[PDB]
């Protein structure tokens, strides 16, 4: 019902914090007033739908007119998934077909994959931490109306890895290792750390092959794993798929420090 859609619409709203939508004055818009349209012309997609939920998250507006501007917004976003083109228009800056495309695949998936597989999905997007965002915001709010425990486990599961993901993005001390690496890429570095944390059952036999993956400088492959021990000691507990990850990861690249030592 147009009722509830609305309750949806400020749920979602809520989600997002987006500073567009409190920045907006509504009251010089001239939104007020009451039968509405497309008045707005010109205007960009993103831009009439912070206008539109500036009236909805309104103090002082009657909700019958919220219902009015909310019927508007479902017309304007299509009916079909609008709840995830809601969070894209309000979640993204530069918000192009590339972009919804993209986000529309990533919520189908998750709606059916490893840290390393998202990322890889991810990685070369504007305003890629955005993008990964509104996913997680979608996930969440499907998860208070799931009936399964088993799509409620998929989903948080989901959640958390994403969540992960945002928190690896949001790191800047790689900087030495991508220093003594050929490629000097941020990425092919970040992507060997994400396999590390997939890599649960963690080798001294594929652990020992990490700088020929990142193709680290010849001489400056045991000086990698130094940086990598520091690197692995310096992350958050939230990056990490069990307690003793931390400890075992550090156990194993001290055993490889250990090992390539001697030869
Ligand atoms: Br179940
Ligand atoms: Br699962």
Not at 1 to 17: S, V
Not at 30 to 56: C, R
Request: hydrophobic share 45%; net charge negative; proline share 2%.
């Amino acid at each position: 019902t147009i009722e509830k859609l609305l309750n949806e619409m400020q749920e979602l709203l809520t989600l997002t914090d987006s500073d567009k939508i409190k920045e907006l004055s509504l009251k010089n818009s001239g939104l007020l007033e009451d039968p509405t349209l497309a008045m707005f012309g010109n205007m960009p997609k993103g831009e009439i739908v912070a206008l539109i939920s500036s009236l909805l998250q309104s103090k002082f507006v009657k909700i019958e007119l919220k219902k009015k501007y909310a019927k508007l917004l479902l017309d304007l976003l299509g009916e079909d998934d609008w709840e995830l083109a809601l969070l894209s228009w309000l979640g993204v800056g530069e918000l192009n077909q590339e972009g919804i495309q993209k986000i529309k695949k990533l919520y189908e998936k998750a709606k059916d994959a490893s840290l390393l597989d998202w990322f890889m999905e991810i990685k070369d997007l504007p305003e890629r931490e955005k993008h990964l965002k509104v996913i997680i915001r979608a996930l969440s709010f499907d998860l208070s109306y799931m009936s399964s425990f088993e799509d409620k486990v998929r989903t948080s599961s989901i959640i958390s890895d994403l969540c992960r993901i945002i928190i690896f993005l949001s790191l800047n001390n790689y900087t030495d290792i991508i220093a003594i690496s050929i490629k000097k890429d941020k990425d092919v570095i970040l992507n060997e750390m994400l396999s590390i944390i997939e890599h649960v059952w963690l080798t001294e036999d594929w652990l020992l092959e990490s700088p020929s993956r990142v193709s680290i400088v010849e001489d400056k492959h045991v000086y990698y794993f130094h940086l990598l021990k520091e690197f692995f000691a310096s992350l958050p507990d939230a990056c990490f798929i069990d307690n003793e990850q931390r400890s075992n990861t550090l156990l194993m690249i001290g055993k490889v420090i250990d090992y390539k030592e001697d030869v």
